[PDB]
Amino acid sequence: KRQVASGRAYIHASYNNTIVTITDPDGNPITWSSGGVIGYKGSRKGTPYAAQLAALDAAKKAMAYGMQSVDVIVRGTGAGREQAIRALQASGLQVKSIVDDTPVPHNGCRPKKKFRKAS
Amino acid sequence: PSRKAKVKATLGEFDLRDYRNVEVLKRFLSETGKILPRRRTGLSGKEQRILAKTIKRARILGLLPFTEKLVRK
Amino acid sequence: ARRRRAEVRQLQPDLVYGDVLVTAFINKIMRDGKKNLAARIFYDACKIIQEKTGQEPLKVFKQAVENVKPRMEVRSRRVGGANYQVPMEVSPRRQQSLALRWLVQAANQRPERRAAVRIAHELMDAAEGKGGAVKKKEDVERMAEANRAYAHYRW
RNA sequence: AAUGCGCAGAUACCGGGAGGAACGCCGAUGGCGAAGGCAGCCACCUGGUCCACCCGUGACGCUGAGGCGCGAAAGCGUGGGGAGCAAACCGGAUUAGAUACCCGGGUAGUCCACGCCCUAAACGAUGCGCGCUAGGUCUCUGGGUCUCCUGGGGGCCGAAGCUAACGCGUUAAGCGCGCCGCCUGGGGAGUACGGCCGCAAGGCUGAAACUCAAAGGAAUUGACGGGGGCCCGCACAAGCGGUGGAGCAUGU
Ligand SMILES: [Mg+2]
Ligand SMILES: [Mg+2]
Ligand SMILES: [Mg+2]
Ligand SMILES: [Mg+2]
Ligand SMILES: [Mg+2]
Ligand SMILES: [Mg+2]
Ligand SMILES: [Mg+2]
Ligand SMILES: [Mg+2]
Ligand SMILES: [Mg+2]
Ligand SMILES: [Mg+2]
Ligand SMILES: [Mg+2]
Ligand SMILES: [Mg+2]
Ligand SMILES: [Mg+2]
Ligand SMILES: [Mg+2]
Ligand SMILES: [Mg+2]
Ligand SMILES: [Mg+2]
Ligand SMILES: [Mg+2]
Ligand SMILES: [Mg+2]
Ligand SMILES: [Mg+2]
Ligand SMILES: [Mg+2]
Ligand SMILES: [Mg+2]
Ligand SMILES: [Mg+2]
Ligand SMILES: [Mg+2]
Ligand SMILES: [Mg+2]
Ligand SMILES: [Mg+2]
Ligand SMILES: [Mg+2]
Ligand SMILES: [Mg+2]
Ligand SMILES: [Mg+2]
Ligand SMILES: [Mg+2]
Ligand SMILES: [Mg+2]
Ligand SMILES: [Mg+2]
Ligand SMILES: [Mg+2]
Ligand SMILES: [Mg+2]
Ligand SMILES: [Mg+2]
Ligand SMILES: [Mg+2]
Ligand SMILES: [Mg+2]
Ligand SMILES: [Mg+2]
Ligand SMILES: [Mg+2]
Ligand SMILES: [Mg+2]
């Protein structure tokens, strides 16, 4: 019952899950959701279908704080990334602008072995 | 194939050592802060080497970005 | 079919409704090459569809086929893991076959003793929305949209 | 998947702080270095190099046993530091087993200073120097009359030629001359012994008895691959009817 109307959607994409946080224009979360929140368990949380629900769930949850307009900020490499956007669009919520903000070091920390092979 | 608008062309009489000429320097970065390749700057082997050192300096002064945010997806 | 896409054969129309579907049904009802008493069944079934309902049989047979045609089905898939039940669309050619086959099979499960009757009641029950044929169709489509997670292997 | 973390409120998101390590794009097909090896930006202090002028000296040159210095990584000593990562190790999985591959942790270490160690697929597996022997082309960096000429450097294709072949070919593996290093069948064996070096781990140097009739280079035709590409077959899939169960026939 905060009332916000205008807000932000952070899609956190990953080869392993998808997590959608909705926030106010300052960045503080109104509500969130993910593959695990829609009752999926293992590999299926990375599945883009999951990502569709995960976004839709997170939407509706926020559409009851009277949201209408969202700035989208995609932030991950994974599957179910664009589908999380697709879901966000088709939820009536006006998507005012999508931005990729995947964080990337200017070569900094020694990565996990799994993620380097040939460096 | 692999050729659109070249950047050395859109401009004219500039100093590649001028690390304050933001209005000119910034034409050489992508939408992200990333310094454009030669195949898009249109600089020669050398000009590019000097411009990259120039852009780098201009980033430390806080005139040019280091990295920005893609706006479509 | 390794070489050519392989075309469908054109069954000659019914002798009594001048229809192709009705030959198809009659063919699925037939066993051991006894086409005479497969037709001798479907038609006996047709007399029964009227003397139990004001409706014309062709319109009912057609009506019930449509209620059994499945819009979705799964067929398994071997991946870089194992068996994944991929939800597929179902071509209009395959819905035909599936419906008819399911109709006969359902019909022959029934406890009525004459064959025509079993066909009759299944054909009727399926029009009116119920009956074993439809149940192994509402079922089939239920496995799709349950493996929805694997829709992203659309072939 | 599970260990694991999370109601002592994690994950996701915004704001502030600490710290350690690495330097995205530019950036490679590039540059520098004797080799190892060198990549954010600025300054200081230094090394090599290349061009033009054709000014100086006047054979002052080349190589180089030993000596001296340098020398990835790992490793060692003293002190510091410690984000991420990670031998050993602790768990979770997987498996016939799993001291492994996969997952969650994790110490030494990876970082810095100083002092050791001195190895390598330390590779172009190609010592250094100088002269000679078609050309084409791409590229880095100078100079001149700058459509083109002329240097230095990095690639590719190729004349002659060389090569067991592969290939090399003005950046020789061509034609020559100088000087150093090294080889002399496989194994035993970089082993033993001695000596020298090291804090240690170890390093250099380096055999013999014995034993084999091969060990080995390149290339050819095949066959094969849980290598690629292309393509067939009731091969699978789609479908109908069966065998496998019963009684009997028949063969084993
Ligand atoms: Mg617990
Ligand atoms: Mg509580
Ligand atoms: Mg965190
Ligand atoms: Mg923070
Ligand atoms: Mg700390
Ligand atoms: Mg070199
Ligand atoms: Mg090297
Ligand atoms: Mg100098
Ligand atoms: Mg003179
Ligand atoms: Mg004189
Ligand atoms: Mg010398
Ligand atoms: Mg060393
Ligand atoms: Mg070291
Ligand atoms: Mg130490
Ligand atoms: Mg220490
Ligand atoms: Mg300590
Ligand atoms: Mg581990
Ligand atoms: Mg770890
Ligand atoms: Mg040291
Ligand atoms: Mg040595
Ligand atoms: Mg020579
Ligand atoms: Mg010029
Ligand atoms: Mg050259
Ligand atoms: Mg070089
Ligand atoms: Mg020849
Ligand atoms: Mg020779
Ligand atoms: Mg030859
Ligand atoms: Mg050649
Ligand atoms: Mg030797
Ligand atoms: Mg011998
Ligand atoms: Mg030997
Ligand atoms: Mg040794
Ligand atoms: Mg000894
Ligand atoms: Mg001693
Ligand atoms: Mg061979
Ligand atoms: Mg083959
Ligand atoms: Mg089959
Ligand atoms: Mg039997
Ligand atoms: Mg016998």
Side-chain angles (χ1 to χ4, degrees):
Chain A
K1 50 177 193 298
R2 270 63 265 154
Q3 310 293 333
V4 284
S6 58
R8 338 166 66 151
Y10 291 92
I11 310 301
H12 181 91
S14 142
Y15 297 113
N16 252 350
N17 193 14
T18 311
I19 127 84
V20 184
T21 297
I22 310 282
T23 61
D24 75 330
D26 287 311
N28 315 272
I30 305 163
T31 181
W32 67 285
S33 171
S34 68
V37 140
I38 342 289
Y40 272 120
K41 281 288 185 174
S43 29
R44 323 224 276 168
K45 315 192 286 210
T47 223
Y49 181 54
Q52 192 191 271
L53 300 124
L56 292 161
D57 174 51
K60 224 84 178 188
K61 269 179 181 183
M63 265 187 291
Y65 273 58
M67 288 258 316
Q68 274 149 287
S69 91
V70 208
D71 299 306
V72 182
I73 314 178
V74 182
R75 188 178 275 170
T77 38
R81 182 234 294 268
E82 237 74 68
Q83 240 287 348
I85 302 173
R86 287 161 145 82
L88 238 313
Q89 285 158 332
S91 76
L93 279 175
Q94 282 286 43
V95 167
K96 317 159 87 282
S97 46
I98 304 156
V99 171
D100 181 284
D101 194 345
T102 291
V104 29
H106 297 359
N107 254 132
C109 274
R110 166 91 161 207
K112 254 167 169 58
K113 181 215 197 168
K114 172 178 44 209
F115 300 161
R116 67 182 275 259
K117 304 199 160 190
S119 66
Chain B
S2 192
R3 257 172 283 181
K4 297 147 252 60
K6 224 83 161 190
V7 174
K8 174 196 187 60
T10 35
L11 287 71
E13 299 72 7
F14 59 72
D15 185 11
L16 281 169
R17 295 201 197 279
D18 192 3
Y19 53 91
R20 299 198 280 152
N21 198 6
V22 196
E23 51 280 49
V24 150
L25 276 256
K26 64 175 184 177
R27 317 272 258 96
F28 289 98
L29 323 186
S30 83
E31 291 58 22
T32 318
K34 301 168 192 319
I35 295 187
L36 291 173
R38 282 231 273 104
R39 53 150 304 262
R40 284 261 287 104
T41 51
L43 293 194
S44 60
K46 185 154 107 170
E47 293 179 331
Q48 183 91 23
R49 208 181 323 125
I50 296 179
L51 143 140
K53 229 235 191 319
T54 283
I55 293 171
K56 285 174 185 190
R57 298 171 147 202
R59 288 169 158 180
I60 305 193
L61 287 185
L63 307 171
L64 295 168
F66 282 91
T67 199
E68 298 287 29
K69 19 168 62 176
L70 187 61
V71 268
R72 300 291 272 279
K73 296 304 307 315
Chain C
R2 227 200 259 262
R3 288 197 199 266
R4 290 146 198 182
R5 197 184 139 107
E7 24 57 30
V8 163
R9 26 188 85 223
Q10 303 301 335
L11 335 79
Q12 288 162 48
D14 181 20
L15 289 301
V16 175
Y17 291 78
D19 192 5
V20 286
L21 241 163
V22 164
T23 316
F25 194 38
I26 287 162
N27 278 19
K28 289 274 190 179
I29 299 156
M30 176 194 66
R31 64 194 41 147
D32 294 342
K34 310 207 188 193
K35 191 191 218 66
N36 192 66
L37 70 123
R40 180 174 276 273
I41 289 175
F42 175 75
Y43 291 147
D44 278 18
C46 284
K47 304 191 191 67
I48 302 173
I49 308 296
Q50 274 175 252
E51 297 203 330
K52 304 278 159 268
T53 295
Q55 300 186 56
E56 42 194 355
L58 189 45
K59 205 175 62 184
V60 180
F61 162 69
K62 275 167 31 263
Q63 178 72 62
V65 171
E66 231 63 36
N67 276 340
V68 184
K69 297 167 80 170
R71 295 102 63 174
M72 226 65 69
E73 49 149 336
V74 279
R75 44 241 310 275
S76 194
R77 183 179 171 179
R78 258 292 174 175
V79 279
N83 292 16
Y84 272 143
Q85 296 308 104
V86 179
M88 290 296 296
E89 281 261 11
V90 212
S91 64
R93 156 81 198 171
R94 172 148 174 81
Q95 296 185 31
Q96 193 78 332
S97 307
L98 277 176
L100 288 163
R101 165 184 325 138
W102 284 341
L103 279 164
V104 187
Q105 295 177 346
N108 271 270
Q109 297 277 22
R110 304 179 121 272
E112 356 253 314
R113 326 242 262 212
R114 303 188 47 157
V117 178
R118 294 198 296 273
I119 274 74
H121 288 55
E122 193 62 23
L123 253 181
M124 294 191 274
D125 277 37
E128 235 228 332
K130 30 192 177 66
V134 203
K135 188 151 301 176
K136 194 204 287 130
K137 166 260 189 213
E138 287 174 14
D139 197 312
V140 178
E141 303 184 27
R142 190 188 299 119
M143 297 201 206
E145 232 282 333
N147 297 259
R148 243 290 242 294
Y150 311 123
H152 61 334
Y153 299 95
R154 328 189 89 172
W155 253 303

